[PDB]
């Protein structure tokens, strides 16, 4: 037979990287309001976080690599999906972030105005 179970083992080993955390979000029939970007051979990364929006309230910031969204796997989730997964409809949703001291970049937007639409 079989059912399922999990377990770990805490040892005196370096943390390597700031362990993952679970940030709760109190949407309440509202959007998150955050930008995400996909990496060549990586995962999803916060590109921005509207201030005053759910996210903000939750306390989300840029660089915070989204590991899992309410369970979903962002590691595989694409920018188009992440932009949706996060833009879902859930009164209360959680996020599994994990600050990574290896994402210090910056870039400027493209030159354009109110075009295309």
Notes on the structure:
The protein has helices spanning 54-58, 79-85, and strands spanning 21-26, 34-38, 44-49, 65-66, 68-69, 72-73, 92-97. The chain is an alpha+beta fold and 117 residues long. The chain has one domain: Pdz3 Domain (Roll). A hairpin with a 5-residue loop joins strand 2 (34-38) and strand 3 (44-49). The longest helix has 7 residues, at 79-85. It starts with 20 loop residues before the first strand and ends in a 20-residue tail after the last strand. Belongs to the MAGUK family.
Protein topology:
Blueprint: E1 21-26, E2 34-38, E3 44-49, H1 54-58, E4 65-66, E5 68-69, E6 72-73, H2 79-85, E7 92-97
Family: Belongs to the MAGUK family.
Domain PDZ: 22-101
Protein name: Disks large homolog 5
Task: List descriptors.
monomer, Pdz3 Domain, 117 residues, globular, alpha+beta, 4-stranded antiparallel β-sheet, Disks large homolog 5, 2 helices
């Amino acid at each position: 037979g079989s059912s399922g179970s999990s377990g770990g083992e805490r040892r005196k080993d370096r943390p390597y990287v700031e362990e993952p955390r679970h940030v709760k979000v109190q949407k309440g029939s509202e959007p998150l309001g955050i930008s995400i970007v996909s990496g060549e051979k990586g995962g999803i990364y916060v590109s921005k976080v509207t201030v005053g929006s759910i996210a903000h309230q939750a306390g989300l910031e840029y660089g915070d690599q989204l590991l899992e969204f309410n369970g979903i796997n962002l590691r595989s989730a694409t920018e188009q999906q992440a932009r949706l997964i996060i833009g879902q409809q859930c009164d209360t949703i959680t996020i599994l972030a994990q600050y990574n001291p290896h994402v210090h970049q910056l870039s400027s937007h493209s030159r354009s105005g109110p075009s295309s639409g």
